[PDB]
Amino acid sequence: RSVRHIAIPAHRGLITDRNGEPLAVSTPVTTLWANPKELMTAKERWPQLAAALGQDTKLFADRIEQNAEREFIYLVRGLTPEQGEGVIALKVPGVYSIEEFRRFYPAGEVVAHAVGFTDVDDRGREGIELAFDEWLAGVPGKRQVLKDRRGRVIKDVQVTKNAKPGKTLALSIDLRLQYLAHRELRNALLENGAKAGSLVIMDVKTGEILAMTNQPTYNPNNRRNLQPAAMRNRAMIDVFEPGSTVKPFSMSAALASGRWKPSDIVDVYPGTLQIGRYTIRDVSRNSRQLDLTGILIKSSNVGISKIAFDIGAESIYSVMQQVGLGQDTGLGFPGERVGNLPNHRKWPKAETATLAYGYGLSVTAIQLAHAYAALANDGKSVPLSMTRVDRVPDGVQVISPEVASTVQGMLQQVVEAQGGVFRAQVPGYHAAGKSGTARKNAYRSLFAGFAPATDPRIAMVVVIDEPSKAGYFGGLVSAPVFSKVMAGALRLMNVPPDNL
Numbered sequence: 494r495s496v497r498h499i500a501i502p503a504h505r506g507l508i509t510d511r512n513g514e515p516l517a518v519s520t521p522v523t524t525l526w527a528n529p530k531e532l533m534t535a536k537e538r539w540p541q542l543a544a545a546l547g548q549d550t551k552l553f554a555d556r557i558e559q560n561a562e563r564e565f566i567y568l569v570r571g572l573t574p575e576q577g578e579g580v581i582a583l584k585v586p587g588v589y590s591i592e593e594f595r596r597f598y599p600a601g602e603v604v605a606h607a608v609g610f611t612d613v614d615d616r617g618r619e620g621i622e623l624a625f626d627e628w629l630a631g632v633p634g635k636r637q638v639l640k641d642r643r644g645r646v647i648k649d650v651q652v653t654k655n656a657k658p659g660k661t662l663a664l665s666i667d668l669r670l671q672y673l674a675h676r677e678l679r680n681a682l683l684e685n686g687a688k689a690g691s692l693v694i695m696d697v698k699t700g701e702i703l704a705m706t707n708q709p710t711y712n713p714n715n716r717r718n719l720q721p722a723a724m725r726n727r728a729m730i731d732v733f734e735p736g737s738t739v740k741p742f743s744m745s746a747a748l749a750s751g752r753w754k755p756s757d758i759v760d761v762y763p764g765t766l767q768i769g770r771y772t773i774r775d776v777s778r779n780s781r782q783l784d785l786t787g788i789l790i791k792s793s794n795v796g797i798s799k800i801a802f803d804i805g806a807e808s809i810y811s812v813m814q815q816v817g818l819g820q821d822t823g824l825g826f827p828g829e830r831v832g833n834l835p836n837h838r839k840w841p842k843a844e845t846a847t848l849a850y851g852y853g854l855s856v857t858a859i860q861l862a863h864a865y866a867a868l869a870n871d872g873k874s875v876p877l878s879m880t881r882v883d884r885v886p887d888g889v890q891v892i893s894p895e896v897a898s899t900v901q902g903m904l905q906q907v908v909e910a911q912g913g914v915f916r917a918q919v920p921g922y923h924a925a926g927k928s929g930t931a932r933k934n935a936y937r938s939l940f941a942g943f944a945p946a947t948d949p950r951i952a953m954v955v956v957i958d959e960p961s962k963a964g965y966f967g968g969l970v971s972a973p974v975f976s977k978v979m980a981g982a983l984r985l986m987n988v989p990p991d992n993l
């Protein structure tokens with residue numbers, strides 16, 4: 494007689510959205526195992542057992558014959574309890590069952606990237622499932638069993654160690670905002686013939702990620718033929734040059750230097766500026782004098798470069814670093830990309846200008862959203878969170894409240910003023926933001942912003958990868974997505990309309 498120990502799989506923790514809507518639920522599944530030595534005593538039962546598992550009779554018979562020495566083998570894993578009962582109804586000697594768990598994702602493709610998924614052993618493999626695997630997994634059980642030389646299960650003597658279920662986890666994601674963001678991002682991609690895209694919604698006061706969607710997406714309940722491209726959480730693992738969307742951070746440095754005020758003027762004529770071998774070039778080159786807001790409205794690289802030369806790159810780098818551009822989010826999602834914020838001891842002129850207009854730096858959509866959240870939250874950065882925040886941690890005042898408030902006002906004018914990004918306007922509210930277009934030929938269309946401009950509640954980033962229509966600029970392609978998603982998100986959150 495031999496004393497052995499069986500491992501009882503633990504029930505994985507429930508994942509909900511911030512309001513308790515289920516997002517990942519552990520489902521009972523039946524795993525069938527067999528004692529081949531016992532199976533050898535009932536060979537007349539094997540065709541019916543193989544036919545029940547949809548296997549060729551000879552292939553399954555060749556499977557058992559080859560394992561006639563092994564005291565344990567798996568027949569099949571993850572059958573539905575019903576399908577598992579049908580195999581048990583055959584009453585084949587040597588066929589035994591184990592109650593396992595498999596995840597079901599009620600929202601499917603809508604929140605696939607944020608929630609993630611489990612592998613064949615019910616352990617987290619991507620997203621939250623992976624990031625919070627220890628919290629969600631719990632601890633398996635240990636059952637004391639009595640076996641013979643062949644491997645036949647005699648009796649369940651005792652439970653040496655009780656299986657501890659995983660714990661519930663409420664995400665910061667609001668499924669109502671997630672669906673709206675998913676749908677509008679999907680529509681935007683198809684209207685623009687784009688390759689991919691991301692959209693992140695953040696609560697500027699709490700650091701919560703209220704929505705995080707990417708295209709292409711996949712159904713995590715039907716993983717057969719798992720296309721690695723469709724599974725990429727682009728918002729957190731795809732880096733890109735933020736371009737003109739970082740000009741507000743360059744202005745924040747300008748305004749904090751004591752050398753600049755919004756009404757100050759920069760001469761950007763003739764729309765180009767030569768600095769050695771390098772040429773800074775504006776898209777529209779029909780300007781001479783522009784005030785600071787004008788530089789943002791016209792998205793002048795020349796304008797922002799001249800301000801950068803005056804204040805020094807050191808001040809600009811420091812703002813960008815403090816808001817978290819090219820920095821660790823601290824979210825702990827394995828494979829999450831940090832990007833890069835270039836640094837110098839002595840900044841040359843070309844690098845100073847390119848830093849100021851976001852060329853040559855690489856950030857993620859989540860980092861860009863977090864930076865805009867700090868600016869929107871009166872210059873106070875609150876740590877990013879993918880789980881529901883009940884007690885808000887202390888923020889870090891990264892930009893002075895006065896400078897942040899001044900920059901907010903200029904971003905509201907970027908959207909509302911004559912010649913501005915009118916497509917980002919949010920009917921019923923004052924919205925603020927900055928569009929961008931990065932040449933990656935091929936382009937990335939960007940919009941980053943927040944609302945309501947007077948008392949900011951939400952920050953949002955829209956990234957559309959390789960739009961294939963005539964208009965590819967951020968203010969054309971991403972600005973309307975920001976408008977539609979923001980109009981919905983603010984109403985879903987019952988934010989009072991502020992354009993009164």
Ligand SMILES: *C(=O)[C@@H](NC(=O)/C(=N\OC(C)(C)C(=O)O)c1csc(N)n1)[C@@H](CC=C)NC(=O)NS(=O)(=O)n1nc(C2=CC(=O)C(O)C=N2)n(CCCS(C)(=O)=O)c1=O
Pocket residue numbers: 734735736737738774775776777791792793794850851852853912913914915916928929930931932933936966967968969
């Ligand atoms: C900031 O993003 C600038 N972009 C760049 O400097 C980069 N590439 O520039 C392009 C033009 C794509 C290129 O080189 O081919 C860049 C930065 S990092 C990287 N790898 N590449 C800026 C260009 C200024 C030099 N682009 C934007 O800011 N785009 S935008 O979304 O603000 N935007 N600009 C325009 C525009 C197009 C015109 O033809 C104009 O005459 C004037 N502006 N639009 C369209 C108009 C929208 S509106 C104002 O009517 O609402 C736009 O959306």
